[PDB]
Scaffold this active site. Structure first.
Site, short mmCIF file in Angstrom:
data_model
loop_
_atom_site.label_atom_id
_atom_site.label_comp_id
_atom_site.label_asym_id
_atom_site.label_seq_id
_atom_site.Cartn_x
_atom_site.Cartn_y
_atom_site.Cartn_z
N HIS A 122 45.95 34.92 40.73
CA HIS A 122 44.63 34.56 41.23
C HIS A 122 43.88 35.83 41.60
O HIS A 122 44.42 36.94 41.52
CB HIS A 122 44.73 33.62 42.43
CG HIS A 122 45.39 34.24 43.62
ND1 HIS A 122 46.69 34.68 43.60
CD2 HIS A 122 44.92 34.51 44.86
CE1 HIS A 122 47.01 35.18 44.78
NE2 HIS A 122 45.95 35.09 45.56
N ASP A 132 40.66 37.12 44.69
CA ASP A 132 40.24 36.86 46.06
C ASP A 132 38.73 36.97 46.17
O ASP A 132 38.09 37.69 45.41
CB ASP A 132 40.91 37.83 47.05
CG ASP A 132 42.42 37.75 47.02
OD1 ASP A 132 42.95 36.64 46.81
OD2 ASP A 132 43.07 38.80 47.20
N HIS A 148 46.60 40.04 41.22
CA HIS A 148 47.91 40.00 41.86
C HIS A 148 48.43 38.57 41.96
O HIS A 148 47.69 37.60 41.82
CB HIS A 148 47.86 40.63 43.25
CG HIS A 148 47.09 39.84 44.26
ND1 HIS A 148 45.72 39.81 44.29
CD2 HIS A 148 47.51 39.05 45.28
CE1 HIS A 148 45.32 39.03 45.28
NE2 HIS A 148 46.38 38.56 45.89
N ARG A 177 59.53 33.31 55.55
CA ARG A 177 58.80 34.56 55.73
C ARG A 177 57.38 34.28 56.19
O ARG A 177 56.81 33.23 55.88
CB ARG A 177 58.78 35.39 54.44
CG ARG A 177 57.70 34.97 53.47
CD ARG A 177 57.70 35.81 52.22
NE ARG A 177 57.08 37.11 52.43
CZ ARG A 177 56.32 37.73 51.54
NH1 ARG A 177 56.08 37.20 50.35
NH2 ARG A 177 55.80 38.92 51.83
O1 AKG Z 1 51.97 36.51 49.08
C1 AKG Z 1 51.35 37.17 48.22
O2 AKG Z 1 51.70 38.30 47.78
C2 AKG Z 1 50.08 36.54 47.69
C3 AKG Z 1 49.23 36.00 48.81
C4 AKG Z 1 47.84 36.31 48.50
O3 AKG Z 1 47.35 37.17 47.82
C5 AKG Z 1 46.92 35.36 49.19
O4 AKG Z 1 47.62 34.67 49.96
O5 AKG Z 1 45.72 35.42 48.90
FE FE2 Z 2 44.91 37.44 47.84
#
Ligand code: AKG
Ligand code: FE2
Ligand code: NAG
Ligand code: NAG
Ligand code: AKG
Ligand code: FE2
Lengths: 219, 219
Positions: A148, A150, A200, A210
């Site tokens: 995805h 951001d 990412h 976690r």
């Molecule tokens: O946990 C991750 O590495 C991805 C989480 C992430 O990018 C998000 O939560 O927007």
């Molecule tokens: Fe993210």
């Protein structure tokens, strides 16, 4: 003034006693990293890795969030969002629900700002953020996320526990660089632009649970 | 319908005869570059270099703009901007003044879009832009620019004449990578994110005049 109706009342003391709050919660190596004698690492292109929070703040925040109990999130549609539909759902506790939003914005304005200004020269920040939350990754409820983007200029990714001692999983994987983050530390923070050039996707976890704290600063 | 009250009336034919417009003005190597058999180059990290316009469109656009004559720009304050103050002034002719704005937006929506989607996987674009202009760099009126950022997701930088034959100068210099672009081509376009991680600054020109077309797409 002192509110005692909290599990850990000292966390809300960022407005009354800034100095003692900084000595107790902020990581002891933050000042050296800010002044530029190493510490800050760049494992992959244009992603940075510096310490922010100590062990006390991580433990205290995790315990306070777990005290809330109502771990909402999971449905594609949303009620906490004005639009009413999430692109990708996760089990999260937004800070507005627990009342820690203003203090978190103050921390972002005070400590994250100057460092991200020194890290990226020529960039001026106001550290205005809207979305910031804590997610819980457990093999039972929900696995890791699909690739995805951001909706922010850059994202801050802070861990809240130790790897191996309490969970056995992984961090982030960058598709455009074949970059994999193996062992994130406890109080260290990840910085990376999250709009265009960083596709990412988080890795899955198999044992334990976690915790991660995210904040989409500068939307 | 056919408006004949133009120097080069065929430029406005992007809405009536798309196919012939594409054959005459769009670069002949664009399709091969889109399909992915080379051509597109990455001289520096996360900046791309592909052909867009042929020689006919470049010459015709330059002549049509020079026919306008009123090369506004230079003052720190502005009248074409709602805010009324420019961060950095340049001598420019915005497309709204010459009436070519809608056709340029159509070109961005049709041709630039799919390629920038294939170049950066996982990114969806609508090619909505507000600021797009043409600048003139001459050693007499105004020199090159100071280091700066851009108020857009990414910028498109298209040249409009030949290097050496008509001007002797340089392209862009990236501060965060010590990357210098020496010889930009005539119809080739430059693509790069312009918000966070690309602190660029254009080089000065000493002999002749040079033309560049810019468009801050996705503000
Ligand atoms: O946990 C991750 O590495 C991805 C989480 C992430 O990018 C998000 O939560 O927007
Ligand atoms: Fe993210
Ligand atoms: C801070 O950095 C020093 C480096 O000399 C290290 O010894 C110390 O353990 C660090 N503090 C931590 C990780 O809490
Ligand atoms: C298009 O690419 C070919 C590569 O074989 C080249 O020979 C030709 O000159 C190019 N067309 C131009 C630069 O207008
Ligand atoms: O002249 C150049 O190539 C850089 C100019 C530019 O990007 C700008 O003026 O914003
Ligand atoms: Fe620019």
């Amino acid at each position: 003034r002192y509110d005692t109706e909290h599990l850990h009342p000292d966390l809300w003391q960022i407005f009354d006693n800034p100095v003692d709050w900084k000595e107790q919660y902020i990581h002891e190596n933050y000042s050296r990293a800010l002044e530029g004698e190493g510490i800050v690492e760049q494992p992959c292109p244009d992603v940075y890795w510096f310490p922010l929070l100590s062990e006390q703040m991580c433990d205290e925040l995790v315990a306070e969030m777990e005290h809330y109990g109502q771990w909402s999130g999971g449905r594609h549609e949303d009620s906490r969002l004005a639009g009413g539909y999430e692109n990708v759902p996760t089990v999260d506790i937004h800070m507005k629900q627990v009342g820690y939003e203003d203090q978190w914005l103050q921390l972002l304005r005070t400590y994250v700002g100057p460092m991200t200004e020194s890290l990226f020269p020529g960039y001026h920040t106001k550290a205005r953020a809207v979305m910031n939350f804590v997610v819980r990754y457990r093999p039972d409820e929900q696995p890791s996320l699909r690739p995805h983007h951001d909706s922010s200029t850059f994202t801050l990714n802070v861990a809240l526990n130790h790897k191996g001692l309490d969970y056995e999983g992984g961090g982030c994987r960058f598709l455009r660089y074949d970059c994999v983050i193996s062992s994130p530390r406890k109080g260290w923070a990840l910085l990376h632009p999250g709009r265009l050039t960083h596709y990412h996707e988080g890795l899955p976890t198999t044992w334990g649970t976690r915790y991660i704290m995210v904040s989409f600063v500068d939307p």
